[PDB]
Amino acid sequence: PHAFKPGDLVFAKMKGYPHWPARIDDIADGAVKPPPNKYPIFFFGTHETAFLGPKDLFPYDKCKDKYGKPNKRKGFNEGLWEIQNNPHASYS
């Protein structure tokens, strides 16, 4: 098993939110230097971005049984559709 790379599918954990379907984005695409050992995360559904370290990143194939369940939070269910059906699309 390897370090996280752009295009990796995850659930990403932030405080006040459930584990959220997300992907690792490419930094070589932005014009922004990431904090040390943090990754640019794109959240499905909301189409928001944040920087998160590996402790908040849960690989999607391993964790979807547990986290890949409908939620009432705004964007979550759309985000589930997007990660399962077109995770690598332009949502921009």
Author numbering: 2 to 93
Anything the authors wrote about it?
The PWWP domain comprises 100–130 amine acids and is often present in chromatin-associated proteins. The canonical β-barrel core harbors an aromatic cage constructed by three aromatic residues, which is a signature feature of the Tudor domain “Royal family”. Taken together, similar to other members in the ‘Royal family’, PWWP domain also exhibits methyllysine histone binding ability.
In order to explore the functional roles of the PWWP domains, we determined the crystal structures of the PWWP domains from 7 different human proteins, namely, BRPF1 (bromodomain and PHD finger-containing protein 1), BRPF2, BRPF3, MUM1 (melanoma associated antigen (mutated) 1), DNMT3A, DNMT3B and HDGF2 (Hepatoma-derived growth factor 2). By fluorescence polarization assay, we found that the PWWP domains in BRPF1, BRPF2, HDGF2, MUM1 and the N-terminal PWWP domains of WHSC1 and WHSC1L1 show weak binding affinity to histones with H3K36, K3K79 or H4K20 methylation.
